Amino acid sequence: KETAAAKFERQHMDSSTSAASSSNYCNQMMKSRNLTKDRCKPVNTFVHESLADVQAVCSQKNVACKNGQTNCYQSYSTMSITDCRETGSSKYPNCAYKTTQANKHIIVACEGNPYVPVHFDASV
Numbered sequence: 001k002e003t004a005a006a007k008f009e010r011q012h013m014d015s016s017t018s019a020a021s022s023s024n025y026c027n028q029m030m031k032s033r034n035l036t037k038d039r040c041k042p043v044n045t046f047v048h049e050s051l052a053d054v055q056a057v058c059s060q061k062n063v064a065c066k067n068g069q070t071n072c073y074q075s076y077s078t079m080s081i082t083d084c085r086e087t088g089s090s091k092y093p094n095c096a097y098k099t100t101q102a103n104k105h106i107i108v109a110c111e112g113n114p115y116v117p118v119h120f121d122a123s124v
């Protein structure tokens with residue numbers, strides 16, 4: 001089965017592009033990565049850095065998670081990311097998203113052994 005680590009890679013990693021996400025990027029990606037299967041995932045972020053660089057965040061700045069848990073980490077350096085937010089008129093199964101590129105510090109929750117990212121908490 002798909003591990004939590006694998007799920008994080010499927011939902012949040014897109015190293016390929018150095019970040020040139022077209023206005024259509026999210027519509028394509030959210031569907032291709034199976035994030036609009038049962039419903040339109042409201043918010044989802046894709047990170048364009050290498051897997052190694054993102055995994056390394058689990059050893060960076062320990063910060064509180066939005067849910068109160070203590071296992072979140074903020075990247076010291078900013079990272080190339082693309083935020084996908086469902087449009088107000090999005091109608092499942094026809095999920096529509098607004099694509100927004102940015103360079104911010106990411107905050108991810110890490111778990112397991114190896115200690116790797118399993119949830120994308122926020123970008124700041």
Ligand SMILES: O=c1ccn([C@@H]2O[C@H](CO)[C@@H](O)[C@H]2OP(=O)(O)O)c(=O)[nH]1
Binds near residue numbers: 043118120121122
């Ligand atoms: O900036 C943000 C904030 C949230 N999320 C994803 O949306 C879920 C609900 O907030 C968050 O749980 C998280 O999905 P998860 O990683 O848990 O699958 C983002 O992707 N980026």
